[PDB]
Amino acid sequence: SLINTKIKPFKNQAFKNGEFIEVTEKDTEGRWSVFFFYPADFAFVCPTELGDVADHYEELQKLGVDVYSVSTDTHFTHKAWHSSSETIAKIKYAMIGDPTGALTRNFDNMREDEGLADRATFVVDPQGIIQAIEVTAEGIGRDASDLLRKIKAAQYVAAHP
């Protein structure tokens, strides 16, 4: 488990609201971060999960939490996915491309014989420390409302040691 460790430095391209931006660990410092990994854009699997986090994106921003989705696809592919799927289209958070797999491996989350990330979610606090981890196989869905509870609880223990 990477629980209670500091995230490693990284530098990736991302797509966010119709534009390309670069993201590094410096963008996460002093912020709450959710890293949301998934295997592949354009898979026949319906992206319910990515869109649920999208639905909750408003509250997450009021709690000072940024959301980053990550797959080993490129940011170009993200822009195309964002254009063709109605569910993906409502995403307003950053979609990080990790074709080198460096970000994915930082989180020990690479399926090495497929070149894809596992279905993992990491909650990271402003000092870069990982406070929560959830991983599931392709049939077990990640519940975005459960994520919010965990994030809110994490902020609480930060305030009340």
Residue 1 as a binder of Cl ion (CB under 5 A): the answer is yes
Closer residue to Cl ion, CB minimum distance, 55 or 114: 114
Q: What element of type H or E holds 83? A: helix 75-84
Q: Which of 154, 95, 147, 160 is nearest to 125 (CA)?
A: 154
Q: Which residues bind its own copies (CB under 8 A)?
A: 1, 3-4, 40-44, 72-74, 76-77, 79-81, 83-84, 98-101, 108-109, 111-116, 118-120, 129, 131-141, 143, 146, 149-150, 153-154, 156-158, 161
E-only strand ranges, 9-161: 11-16, 19-24, 32-37, 65-71, 94-97, 110-111, 116-117, 119-124, 130-136
Contacts of 158 (CB under 8 A, 6+ apart): 125
Nearest distance, CB of residue 83 and its own copies, angstroms: 8
* Partner in contact with 132, chosen from its own copies, Cl ion, none, beta carbon below 5 to 8 Å by kind: its own copies
Residue 132 as a binder of Cl ion (CB under 5 A): the answer is no
> Could you say which of 46, 63, 153, 157 is catalytic?
46
Closer residue to its own copies, CB minimum distance, 6 or 76: 76
Residue 101 as a binder of Cl ion (CB under 5 A): the answer is yes
46 is catalytic: yes
Nearest distance, CB of residue 118 and its own copies, angstroms: 5
User: Exposed, middle or buried, 141 (CB in 10 Å: 0-12/13-18/19+)?
Assistant: exposed
What's the rounded Cα separation, in Å, for the pair 102 and 63? Answer: 28
Closer residue to its own copies, CB minimum distance, 26 or 42: 42
Q: Would you name the residues annotated as active-site residues?
A: 46
